């Protein structure tokens, strides 16, 4: 039976799915014109960049 | 430095490529009461590519 | 606490250049305001006088 230790495997899967999704959240343009900070400071001035 | 532009309905698009544009050389022309940039600042142009 | 009134003349279409976090030959090479500025800026006509 390959699904015998699913209770334990779910743990390491959720812990991975918790961080992996947390990495994709960096692509989320939260009310911003870009999700990369270096692109903002390079395209806008500090007053409008902040 | 052109003599006569076109109408608002027949505006003439002037494609520009394979060059290096020093936008500072535009200010020395007629006054610019409005130099608004909606995606970037009017200063970060000489540091970015297009 | 401490108020200072800095003054200098500009011949018209250059007033928008004096702002915290701005670049140019009149900003990096002439007069620069800080990024943590706390004050106000003024600009006005002085025809007959000058």
Swiss-Prot record, chain B:
It comes from the Viruses. Attaches the virion to the cell membrane by interacting with host receptor, initiating the infection. The major receptor is host ACE2. When S2/S2' has been cleaved, binding to the receptor triggers direct fusion at the cell membrane. When S2/S2' has not been cleaved, binding to the receptor results in internalization of the virus by endocytosis using host TFRC and GRM2 and leading to fusion of the virion membrane with the host endosomal membrane. Alternatively, may use NRP1/NRP2 and integrin as entry receptors. The gene is S. Glycans are attached at residue 1. Binds to host ACE2. RBD also interacts with the N-linked glycan on 'Asn-90' of ACE2. Cleavage of S generates a polybasic C-terminal sequence on S1 that binds to host Neuropilin-1 (NRP1) and Neuropilin-2 (NRP2) receptors. Interacts with host integrin alpha-5/beta-1 (ITGA5:ITGB1) and with ACE2 in complex with integrin alpha-5/beta-1 (ITGA5:ITGB1). May interact via cytoplasmic c-terminus with M protein. May interact (via N-terminus) with host bilirubin and biliverdin, thereby preventing antibody binding to the SARS-CoV-2 spike NTD via an allosteric mechanism. This is Spike protein S1.
């Amino acid at each position: 039976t390959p699904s015998a230790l699913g209770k334990l495997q779910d743990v390491v899967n959720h812990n991975a799915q918790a961080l992996n999704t947390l990495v994709k959240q960096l692509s989320s343009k939260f009310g911003a014109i870009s999700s990369v900070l270096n692109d903002i400071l390079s395209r806008l001035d500090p007053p409008e960049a902040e | 430095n052109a003599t006569t532009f076109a109408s608002v309905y027949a505006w003439n698009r002037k494609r520009i490529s394979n060059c290096v544009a020093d936008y500072s050389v535009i200010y020395n022309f007629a006054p610019f009461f409005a130099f608004k940039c909606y995606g970037v600042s009017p200063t970060k142009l000489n540091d970015l590519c297009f | 606490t401490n108020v200072y009134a800095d003054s200098f003349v500009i011949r018209g279409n250059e007033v928008s250049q004096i702002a915290p976090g701005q670049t140019g030959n009149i900003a990096d090479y002439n007069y620069k305001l800080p990024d943590d500025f706390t004050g106000c800026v003024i600009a006005w006509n002085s025809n007959k006088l000058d």
